[PDB]
Design an enzyme around this catalytic site. Structure first.
Site, PDB file in Angstrom:
ATOM      1  NE  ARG A  89      -3.560   1.532   1.485  1.00  0.00           N
ATOM      2  CZ  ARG A  89      -4.460   2.392   2.014  1.00  0.00           C
ATOM      3  NH1 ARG A  89      -5.182   1.918   3.171  1.00  0.00           N
ATOM      4  NH2 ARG A  89      -4.522   3.595   1.796  1.00  0.00           N
ATOM      5  CG  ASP A 134      -3.472   2.800   7.620  1.00  0.00           C
ATOM      6  OD1 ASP A 134      -3.175   2.348   6.570  1.00  0.00           O
ATOM      7  OD2 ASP A 134      -3.947   4.020   8.062  1.00  0.00           O
ATOM      8  CD  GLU A 190      -3.263  10.585   2.833  1.00  0.00           C
ATOM      9  OE1 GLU A 190      -2.979   9.471   3.269  1.00  0.00           O
ATOM     10  OE2 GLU A 190      -4.322  10.718   2.135  1.00  0.00           O
ATOM     11  NE  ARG A 230      -8.112  11.621   2.965  1.00  0.00           N
ATOM     12  CZ  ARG A 230      -8.050  10.102   3.364  1.00  0.00           C
ATOM     13  NH1 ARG A 230      -6.848   9.457   2.744  1.00  0.00           N
ATOM     14  NH2 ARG A 230      -9.036   9.651   4.022  1.00  0.00           N
ATOM     15  NE  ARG A 252      -9.913   5.812  -0.089  1.00  0.00           N
ATOM     16  CZ  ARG A 252      -8.787   5.780   0.742  1.00  0.00           C
ATOM     17  NH1 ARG A 252      -8.377   4.587   1.083  1.00  0.00           N
ATOM     18  NH2 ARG A 252      -8.650   6.707   1.638  1.00  0.00           N
ATOM     19  CE1 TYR A 261      -4.882   6.627   0.791  1.00  0.00           C
ATOM     20  CE2 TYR A 261      -2.633   7.305   1.343  1.00  0.00           C
ATOM     21  CZ  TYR A 261      -3.833   7.160   1.574  1.00  0.00           C
ATOM     22  OH  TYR A 261      -4.602   7.654   2.743  1.00  0.00           O
TER      23      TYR A 261
HETATM   24  C1  LIG Z   1       1.788   7.438  11.886  1.00  0.00           C
HETATM   25  O1  LIG Z   1       0.563   6.603  11.872  1.00  0.00           O
HETATM   26  C2  LIG Z   1      -0.282   6.692  10.742  1.00  0.00           C
HETATM   27  C3  LIG Z   1      -0.353   7.876   9.833  1.00  0.00           C
HETATM   28  C4  LIG Z   1      -1.169   7.821   8.984  1.00  0.00           C
HETATM   29  C5  LIG Z   1      -2.458   7.181   8.969  1.00  0.00           C
HETATM   30  C6  LIG Z   1      -3.589   7.451   8.038  1.00  0.00           C
HETATM   31  N1  LIG Z   1      -3.526   6.438   7.000  1.00  0.00           N
HETATM   32  C7  LIG Z   1      -4.589   6.793   6.141  1.00  0.00           C
HETATM   33  C8  LIG Z   1      -4.967   5.768   4.979  1.00  0.00           C
HETATM   34  S1  LIG Z   1      -6.679   5.658   4.832  1.00  0.00           S
HETATM   35  O2  LIG Z   1      -7.416   5.071   5.703  1.00  0.00           O
HETATM   36  O3  LIG Z   1      -7.330   6.897   4.226  1.00  0.00           O
HETATM   37  O4  LIG Z   1      -7.091   4.508   3.611  1.00  0.00           O
HETATM   38  C9  LIG Z   1      -2.457   6.075   9.958  1.00  0.00           C
HETATM   39  C10 LIG Z   1      -1.623   5.847  10.620  1.00  0.00           C
HETATM   40 CL1  LIG Z   1      -1.572   4.617  12.043  1.00  0.00          CL
END
Ligand SMILES: COc1ccc(CNCCS(=O)(=O)O)cc1Cl
Length: 658
Positions: A207, A232, A503, A519, A581, A615
């Site tokens: 990812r 995540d 982001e 975003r 998405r 993404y």
């Molecule tokens: C530093 O740790 C992190 C940073 C960003 C995020 C967010 N990622 C988002 C992906 S999504 O849920 O939009 O597909 C999660 C964690 Cl645990």
């Protein structure tokens, strides 16, 4: 090993095709292979490509099918009422529809193997399911089968799951063919894989793709090597890189830019059932979200990623704390020792572990790789491995010793359970990477770390300025370096959002002029502009003509090197949908040199509007083609977790987009 039946060029136009007379009396034995090259660029919601049925009254659930959904999902049904057997195996996001205007020839290989009691499906070279059953049902050993069908299933005289599409070629075998023979079958893929299951990362899932074109013409890519499914957090995640020296045509076997060893790199098949899919590797340190930039002055490549220790939580871990202590005007990393209830230690100059209660140093030091030493001796912990043998996830010690790291669960000294930002460098354009250093706090001692914006940093054309976008609550926090990433300062830019995943990606419109696309939580992509090379930032505006979901998705952006219709151009990559998405697009904008406004003139659909697109990473390749590395699935949906090989790469030319 030749086919019992071979047929071709069938048009499925909502009218099934009968092939019973041709195929049915050829079927024998209990193992079969189906090979099918088909197109479907305008599918119905749910349609069967191929069916074997008992079409007689009262046997509506006695049939075999190969079916697809307009979501891109593929599967088979294997049903026999008299045997009490109704099997359904599928996987979301298994198909292509369109590419560069034309419908894609998908190659489907279904294997039904009576000996192993196993069914296996491949599409376009990718195994999308492999299922073993206690009681095996041979696909033509279904009671009373009397019809073989293309483009529907004949149930009780009627056409169910009518298909719009075509089948250019179909073959059947009274054998379960070997995995090796399968690999000899030619494909017609519009895509290639850079990272993939079984490669050197040994991660089953990937990812967060990035791409960046280096000045030598080498194209670099980074990505989350995700081990505990596509979660995540909590999980094990490494940061892996690969490069291409031939304009995207072939790619190097990946290496790690960032890794931890507290848990073994395991290729694991993560459960997709509703009871088990939220299982998580819970005791591992990991990374997440990589960003790349290249510094013109030193020639280094710089890669940043978010880091998390093993003890990180969801809540109460650890906002309002940066994990550093300010002493004078300097930041030192806090530690906590085993039995202590607070963080009574710090890491001062040359890794010495000081005791804050007594301000006196200890016989412990912390090395370049965040590893613990006592009197100069490498301390170690035992590594963990994960399995689902007990019918649920277990994390257990595996005998192997590894260096004691302050991000680990078993470590004598622990960092604050919050998020940090790490940085690594390569001096060989991605052939090896240095041990990462933690970046210091930017919003003070008492504020958890910001979040790296995954994708690219920005290297300004007309100076040595390097910028990495991060996000926190209420603002974009840009990280600015003028000295090859040795020192950083921040430039804060307020946004109208609390707790957004903002982001952000930057393009330079012209010297010193940065537009950042990001975003939001509004269903529209936002932007702001800097005209002083990132010192100050405009108010936020929004794009119309593109839609995202309320929760939104990461968007990728590049300044195109060449004019289009006489004007300077910018390319955005994003899903275009307010539902999920899907509906991936490349959107071309021309800049109005009078106000620096952007007219979004061209929309290129990457695949069907109903097919997954999440993404993404865009880069202009040295030959002026465009490379796109992207999540070809809905990485938000709770129904498309833990798919392998959905991160894919395509090559496009500008004329393709216009
Ligand atoms: C530093 O740790 C992190 C940073 C960003 C995020 C967010 N990622 C988002 C992906 S999504 O849920 O939009 O597909 C999660 C964690 Cl645990």
């Amino acid at each position: 090993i030749s086919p019992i039946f071979q047929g071709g060029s069938y048009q499925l136009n909502n009218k099934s095709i009968d092939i019973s007379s041709l195929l049915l009396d050829k079927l024998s034995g209990e193992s079969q292979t189906v090979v099918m090259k088909f197109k479907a660029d305008k599918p119905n919601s749910l349609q069967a490509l191929f069916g074997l049925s008992n079409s007689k009254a009262g046997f509506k659930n006695n049939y075999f099918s190969i079916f697809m959904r307009d979501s891109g999902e593929i599967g088979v049904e294997i049903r026999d009422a008299q045997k009490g057997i109704n099997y359904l195996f599928s996987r979301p996001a298994s198909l292509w529809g369109k590419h560069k205007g034309q419908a894609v020839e998908n190659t489907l290989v279904f294997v039904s193997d009576s000996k192993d009691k196993t069914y296996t499906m491949y599409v376009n070279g990718i195994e999308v399911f492999s299922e073993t059953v206690d009681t095996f049902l041979p696909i033509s050993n279904i009671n009373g089968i009397d019809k073989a069908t293309l483009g529907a299933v004949n149930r009780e005289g009627k056409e169910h799951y009518l298909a719009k599409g075509s089948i250019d070629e179909i073959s059947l075998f009274n054998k379960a063919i070997s995995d090796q023979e399968v690999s000899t079958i030619p494909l017609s893929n519009p895509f290639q894989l850079i990272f993939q299951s079984g490669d050197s990362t040994q991660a089953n899932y990937f990812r967060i793709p990035t791409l960046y074109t280096l000045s030598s013409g080498r194209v670099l890519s980074s990505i989350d090597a995700r081990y505990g499914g596509t979660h995540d957090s909590k999980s094990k995640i490494n940061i892996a890189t690969s490069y291409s020296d031939d304009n995207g045509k072939t790619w190097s076997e990946p290496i790690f830019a960032m890794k931890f060893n507290d848990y073994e790199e395991q290729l694991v098949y993560w459960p997709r059932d509703n009871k088990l899919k939220n299982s998580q590797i819970s005791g591992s340190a990991s990374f997440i979200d990589s960003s790349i930039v290249e510094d013109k002055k030193s020639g280094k490549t710089i890669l940043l990623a978010d880091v998390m220790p093993a003890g990180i939580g969801n809540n109460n871990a650890n906002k309002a704390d940066s994990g550093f202590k300010e002493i004078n005007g300097h930041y030192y990393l806090k530690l906590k020792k085993n039995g202590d209830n607070d963080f009574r230690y710090t890491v001062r100059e040359n890794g010495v572990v000081y005791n804050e209660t007594t301000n006196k140093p200890t016989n412990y030091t912390i090395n370049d790789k965040y590893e613990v030493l006592e009197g100069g001796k490498s301390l170690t912990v035992e590594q963990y491995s994960v399995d689902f043998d007990s019918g649920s996830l277990r994390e257990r010690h595996n005998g192997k010793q590894v260096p004691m790291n302050v991000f680990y669960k078993d470590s004598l000294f622990k960092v604050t359970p919050t998020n940090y930002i790490a940085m690594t460098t390569s001096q060989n354009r991605g052939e090896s990477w240095e041990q990462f250093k933690l970046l210091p706090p930017f919003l003070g001692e008492k504020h958890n770390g910001t979040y790296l914006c995954p994708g690219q940093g920005l290297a300004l054309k007309s100076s040595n300025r390097l910028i990495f976008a991060t996000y926190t609550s209420g603002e974009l926090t840009y990280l600015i370096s003028d000295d090859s990433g040795q020192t950083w300062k921040k430039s804060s830019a307020s946004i109208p959002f609390k707790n957004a995943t903002a982001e952000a990606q930057m393009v330079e419109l012209r010297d010193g002029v940065i537009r950042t696309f990001f975003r939001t939580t509004t269903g529209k992509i936002a932007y702001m502009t800097s005209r002083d090379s990132g010192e100050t930032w405009s108010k936020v505006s929004y794009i119309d003509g593109i839609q995202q979901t309320s929760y939104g998705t990461q968007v990728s952006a590049i300044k195109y090197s060449q004019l289009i219709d006489g004007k300077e151009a910018v390319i955005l990559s994003t899903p275009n949908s307010r539902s999920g998405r899907k509906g991936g697009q490349l959107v071309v904008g021309l800049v109005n040199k009078e106000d620096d406004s952007i007219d979004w003139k061209y929309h290129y659909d990457i695949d069907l509007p109903s097919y997954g697109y999440a993404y993404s990473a865009i880069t202009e390749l040295p030959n002026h083609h465009i490379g796109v590395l992207f999540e070809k699935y809905d990485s938000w949906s709770r129904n498309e977790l833990h798919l392998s090989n959905v991160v894919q790469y395509i090559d496009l030319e500008i004329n393709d987009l216009t």
